[PDB]
Each structure stands twice: as structure tokens, then as C-alpha cells.
Design a protein around this ligand. Structure first.
Ligand SMILES: [Zn+2]
Length: 544
């Protein structure tokens, strides 16, 4: 009955999708698929974050327009996400008319409401190229240790940090020219005016405890005003009434959440849903799945901007930790910085979806992809626990019973044990306690395989006169498989499709209450094959 709008953070347009992005998009997709299974109206919304100085400069380096470059990367990203079955209702771009109109609208309301301040700043400027330089486009000699060729605000030899204005013999990374200090008028969002409102959000109990604790540190330090403008030359949207000034990504990137939804509504010819979801009086739910590095933005700047422009605020923020591989941050030299596209050359999507889901929880702790454990766990749980219930039983049904399952459950009390677990498992999906859900599902899978072992169909099948017993045993196992695959349907979309083809039925959450009786199933080739460490080694080699 609920109306739910769910986002993931917008991938930056100047890098390929990697396993860190995939943790976030898979986590959100599992949640979204569960919510759809429970009958809710769900809109899963994302987009590429496509503006700014690094994008402008990279396109100039490539000798193509920024529009061409971001279009190519948007296609690459969407191809990768589609390969992992991320079920967006719309994937748009911050470089869009919807985002331009919403950025202009929000800015105009913030300004009319007194929340935009003008301030003159001083920044390093490349007088040959004719542009202000972000810190990382200034290089020079470390003032402390005198090491040459250091970039931005820190030295990678001695570890010192300093303003780039302290670098010795500074050079523009863009042109090689010596930069100079130049003043410019910038426009700032008066975030400190929302401090009391934001403090009340933190105490409310909606947010992850770990997230609320971080916000307390930020209130202690004191909220600052945030620059929302950039000078030309820029790739982005110009500020009304301010020639030569553009919206900085702080302002336009999250508006892409709104612009992507507006695009979806407009393409559908739906003239009511945008306001229904984003007006202050909305009864729809708004959730953002994000990582640890963007908590401050989404918990402080973003709700303040929405409040100040007369829009509703997020219902909650769902924050996850970082991905590690083999216990450490992804490492290019070790081949553990793994692209989504590369992953799919070696493994299917369901394997990684399962592995991350088995590790995920409602906390912000990091998620480790241990590659040895990945092989062991996929083979143990998918191949040998869940799919085994179908593969060990379906042959007898197809070959000796014309594909027809028994007319009654052999063990109705065991079946009820499995259906009774739906409440706790669904609550675990709902609360983002994914690891708890998987543990419960796999405990049931162990109980199902225990049942089959106890009945010993490989013995019954060779014994004269026991056809009916064999059909009963094997049909019971297949019905337990039906239930387990329903619980795993948010996690394993492709395996689920194969299971539905075998079972001749769509799997629905409520459908488990009606077992398959006197019901024709289909033959299948392997539903899921084993993986091995040779494939892991190949993936690692390919990623170096
Ligand atoms: Zn140094």
C-alpha cells in the first residue's frame, strides 16, 4: 500500500563502475525487490553525476565534447548495472533539462528565503588557461621536505599537509603556467541557519545510531556555510542573473534524485506523482542508500536545502560501509581493484549478489569480499544447499512420474516450519538485516536437505514397489525448494527465473501458503554450476 522512492548515490561520470559501487546498488536492489514482492509502489531512481571541472578537463584532454564523453560513460554504467540486474525504474543524468529547471527553482527559493550569501574568495588561478584551479590541479614542491612534483594539499613523501598556496614553485597541472591568487564572488548556502532543525533530526531515532553519533561531532565543530557556485569555464548549469557563474555540484548533484524522478513522471505522462512524492505534505516514503563518505552531505546539507526550498526531507538514510577485498582496500597492484564489467567476464551476477547479501547488515561496517571464502560459500550454499534440493529430486519426478508432483505433502508439519519463517525472514529483509535473513534461509536449507537424507531417495528408488514413496519424497523436497527460492528471490534474480521455469510458476511471497500439488514441473539443465579458485586467479590477473 506504500509509495516508496528509493535512490542510490549517483555514480560519477568519469570512472567505471567497480565492486564498491556494486555493494551499494545490490544492497538497494535487494531491498527494492523485496518491497515490490510485498505489493508496494516502489520507484527505484538513479542517474550519472555528470558535471564539473574534472569532467570538463578530461573531455578537453580526449578532444571530444563533454556531452559525448558523459554519454559514453552513461551507457557503460547502465550496461554494467543491467548485467547485475539492478532494477531501476529510471536511470537519468544530472545533465538534463529536468535538473536544470529544478536547480534553478531551488536556488531561486533559497535566495528569496534569505539562505544564499555572497562572499568574495581568493583562489589560485591559471592565467594562461584562464581558469581557477581546484587544489588537485596545482602541483609544486613540498614546503616542508622540498620534494618536487607534489599535488594539491599534501605531500606523498613526508606526509605534510598544507594549503596549495604554500607549495614552492607552483605549476598548473592544466597548462604548466605559474598560478596566481585571484578574487571571485561566490554564493554560499547558509546551512548554519538550519542547525536546530538538523539537531532535532539526529535525536529522533530514525537514523542509524552510528550515523547519528557522527553528526554530533559535526555539530560540535560547528556547521559552516557551503559554496554552491563555480566560475566559468565550467561544464554545468549557469546561475540565473549571475553571468559567468555556475552551480557547483553540491547543489546540482542531489537535485538529480529529483530530476530523475521528474523525468520518469514526464515520460509516463504522469502529471501528479512528482508533487505527491516531493511536496512537504507527502505521505510517500523517501529513502537514500549511500556510503560512509557522503553522510555529512545527505544528513545536513541536503535536508536543509529541501526544507529551505519547500520540499519534503528524506524519511531515512540507509548507510553502508566500504568494500574490502581479502581484508584490505582494493589494490590495483594486487589485482583487487575489480571493475563490474570485468567481474561478469568470470562470474555471474547472482554469485556476488549472494555473497554481499550474506555479509550485509543494518550497520555501517565494512563488507569484506574474501575471494577464497567467496568460492567456498557460493558452492556450499547455492549449489550444495539450495539448488541441491531441486537437482537431487527433479530427475526422479521427470523420469518416473512424467513431471508430476504428488497430490499431497509428505510432511505437512515440516512444510509449515518453512512457511512460518516468512515473517522473520521478511522482517529481516525489511530492516536491512540481510545477513540474518540469509542465515535463516540457509538453516532451513539445511533442514530440507536433512529431511531428504533421512528419507534416502537413492535407496527408495532401487526398491521394488516404492514408486509412491519416491514421488512423495522428491515432491516434498521440490516444495521446500519453492519456498526457499521465494525467500531468495530478491537476492538471486537470474537463478529465480530459472527456478520459475522449472517449477512452472511465478514465485510470490504469499504463494508459499499453497504448495505445488498434482502439478507439472519441467526438466532443466544445470540450475547453477560450481565455481573454483582458478576463476578467482583469472579475475585477479585480468584486473592488474
Ligand atoms: Zn614533503
Amino acid at each position: 500500500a506504500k509509495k516508496i522512492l528509493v535512490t542510490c548515490a549517483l555514480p560519477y561520470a568519469n570512472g567505471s563502475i567497480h565492486l564498491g559501487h556494486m555493494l551499494e546498488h545490490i544492497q538497494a536492489d535487494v531491498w527494492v525487490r523485496y518491497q515490490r514482492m510485498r505489493g508496494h509502489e516502489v520507484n527505484f531512481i538513479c542517474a550519472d553525476d555528470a558535471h564539473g571541472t574534472p569532467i570538463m578537463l578530461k573531455a578537453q584532454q580526449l578532444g571530444i565534447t563533454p556531452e559525448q564523453m558523459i554519454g559514453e560513460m552513461s551507457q557503460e554504467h547502465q550496461t554494467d548495472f543491467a548485467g547485475f540486474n539492478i532494477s531501476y525504474d529510471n536511470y537519468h543524468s544530472t545533465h538534463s533539462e529536468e535538473n536544470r529547471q529544478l536547480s534553478e527553482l531551488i536556488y531561486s527559493r533559497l535566495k528569496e528565503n534569505g539562505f544564499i550569501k555572497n562572499r568574495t574568495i581568493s583562489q589560485l588561478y591559471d592565467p594562461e588557461k584562464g581558469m581557477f584551479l581546484p587544489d588537485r590541479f596545482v602541483k609544486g614542491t613540498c614546503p616542508k621536505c622540498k620534494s618536487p612534483d607534489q599535488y594539491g594539499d599534501n605531500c606523498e613523501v613526508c606526509g605534510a599537509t598544507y594549503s596549495p598556496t604554500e607549495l614552492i614553485e607552483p605549476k598548473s597541472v592544466v597548462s604548466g603556467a605559474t598560478p596566481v591568487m585571484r578574487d571571485s564572488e561566490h554564493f554560499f548556502f547558509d546551512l548554519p541557519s538550519f542547525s536546530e532543525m538538523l539537531q532535532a533530526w539526529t535525536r529522533s531515532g530514525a537514523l542509524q545510531e552510528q550515523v547519528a553519533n557522527k553528526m554530533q561531532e559535526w555539530f560540535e565543530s560547528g556547521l559552516q556555510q557551503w559554496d554552491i557556485s563555480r566560475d566559468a569555464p565550467y561544464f554545468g548549469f549557469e546561475i540565473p542573473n549571475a553571468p559567468g557563474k555556475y552551480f557547483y555540484v553540491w547543489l546540482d548533484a542531489p537535485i538529480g534524485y529529483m530530476g530523475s524522478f521528474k523525468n520518469l513522471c514526464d515520460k509516463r505522462g504522469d502529471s501528479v506523482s512528482f508533487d505527491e512524492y516531493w511536496k512537504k505534505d507527502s505521505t510517500a516514503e523517501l529513502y537514500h542508500f549511500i556510503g560512509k563518505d557522503i553522510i555529512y552531505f545527505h544528513s545536513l546539507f541536503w535536508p536543509a536545502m529541501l526544507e529551505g526550498s519547500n520540499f519534503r526531507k528524506p524519511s531515512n538514510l540507509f548507510v553502508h560501509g566500504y568494500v574490502t577485498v581479502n581484508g584490505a582496500k582494493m589494490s590495483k597492484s594486487r589485482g583487487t581493484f575489480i571493475k563490474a564489467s570485468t567481474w561478469l567476464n568470470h562470474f555471474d551476477a547472482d554469485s556476488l549478489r549472494y555473497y554481499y547479501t550474506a555479509k550485509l547488515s543494518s550497520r555501517i561496517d565494512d563488507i569484506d569480499l574474501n575471494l577464497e571464502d567467496f568460492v567456498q560459500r557460493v558452492n556450499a550454499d547455492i549449489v550444495n544447499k539450495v539448488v541441491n534440493l531441486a537437482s537431487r529430486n527433479a530427475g526422479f519426478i521427470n523420469k518416473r512420474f512424467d513431471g508430476v508432483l504428488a497430490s499431497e505433502l509428505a510432511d505437512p508439519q515440516l512444510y509449515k516450519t518453512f512457511t512460518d519463517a516468512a515473517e522473520v525472514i521478511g522482517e529481516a529483509w525489511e530492516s536491512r538485516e540481510f545477513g540474518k535473513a540469509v542465515r535463516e534461509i540457509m538453516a532451513l536449507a539445511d533442514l530440507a536437505n536433512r529431511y531428504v537424507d533421512e528419507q534416502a531417495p537413492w535407496v527408495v528408488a532401487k526398491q521394488e514397489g516404492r514408486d509412491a514413496d519416491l514421488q512423495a519424497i522428491c515432491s516434498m523436497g521440490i516444495n521446500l525448494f519453492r519456498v526457499l527460492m521465494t525467500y531468495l528471490k530478491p537476492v538471486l534474480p537470474k537463478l529465480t527465473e530459472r527456478a520459475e521455469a522449472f517449477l512452472n510458476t511465478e514465485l510470490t511471497w504469499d504463494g508459499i501458503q499453497q504448495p505445488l500439488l498434482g502439478h507439472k514441473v519441467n526438466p532443466f539443465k544445470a540450475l547453477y554450476n560450481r565455481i573454483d579458485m582458478r576463476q578467482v586467479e583469472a579475475l585477479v590477473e585480468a584486473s592488474k
